[PDB]
């Protein structure tokens, strides 16, 4: 549910 | 006369931006004095408490740091993890380093985002830290390390550095001290966010800004008023923060009420009515309630 830029 | 979303000039930030490339990952960083600050997840996508050992064994030679504006390649002599950030000591001191301050941002405050890629600020836009400690920004891969900042007379106030994007296209990061805003971490897992809540001070500012630039007497303006105390009782059940969220905002709001000749009690009742009667009305160039207009930035551009 979340992604590192 | 005209009230706009004012942004701070990004030239000072541009001269300090650098690119950090550690093996596979490539992101951005800021270079102040002899220290380069950048997100820690450039050395890998780790979790919990393994960052201390992973950073302590990271080779300084694997850090490729380049300042594109100044055309200078940097060499890292030491690596220090401060919070969720890495403090890379470099040999060269940035001659473009301004008088800067690391100021943590409270919710409801605005800031300019210098969206950068490969160390070059590509775009610049305005955000406000929401009550859920998230910003609603615009980023792609490689944009991590972009900074959020403000200015106060050649003094650069850094407040934010980008880290992570959530599926709802909300964004989270740390201050320049390494500590995240809210209970979010730099991990690609499901993280719960507190329910959205409107920064009522800013929503009041948006409505006042419309009264001073678009229409002083619009049709959706309430012909009725409600007390602050009665509004706060309604606000508890309608995702609106207790008014006022900042006592210092009252001087700006009272000034706006005197200029627009509309008391704040009329604005607050308009907010309540707009929850059920807006029907797609465009208010200050927006189709919904915005927290991007702060009372200070609206009052600073108003007559008297």
Numbering used by the authors:
A (entry chain J): 1 to 5
B (entry chain A): 1 to 304
Source paper text:
We cocrystallized PDCoV Mpro with a Michael acceptor inhibitor, named N3, and determined the structure of the complex at 2.60 Å resolution. The crystal structure contained six Mpro molecules per asymmetric unit. In the crystals, two neighboring molecules, protomer A and protomer B, formed a typical homodimer. Each protomer contains three domains: domain I (residues 1–97), domain II (residues 98–186) and domain III (residues 200–304). Domain I and II each have a chymotrypsin-like fold, and domain III is composed of five α-helixes and contributes to the formation of a homodimer. As an irreversible inhibitor, the Cβ atom of the vinyl group on N3 is bound to the Sγ atom of Cys-144 through a 1.8 Å covalent bond. The lactam ring of the glutamine analog N3 at the P1 site inserts into the S1 pocket and forms 3.2 Å, 2.5 Å and 2.9 Å hydrogen bonds with the carbonyl oxygen of Phe-139, the imidazole ring NH of His-162 and the Oε1 atom of Glu-165, respectively. The side chain of Leu at the P2 position extends into the S2 pocket and participates in hydrophobic interactions with the hydrophobic amino acids Trp, Ile and Phe. Surprisingly, the loop from residues 41–51 of PDCoV Mpro adopts a conformation similar to that of IBV Mpro, which supports that the Deltacoronavirus may be closely related to Gammacoronavirus.
CoV main proteases (Mpros), also called 3C-like proteases, which play a vital role in the proteolytic pathway in viral replication, are known to be among the most attractive and ideal targets for antiviral drug design. Mpros are responsible for cleavage at no fewer than 11 sites, indicating their main role in virus replication and pathogenesis. Mpros always function as dimers and employ conserved cysteine and histidine residues at their catalytic site as charge-relay systems. Porcine deltacoronavirus (PDCoV) is a novel CoV that belongs to the genus Deltacoronavirus and causes atrophic enteritis, severe diarrhea, vomiting and dehydration in pigs.
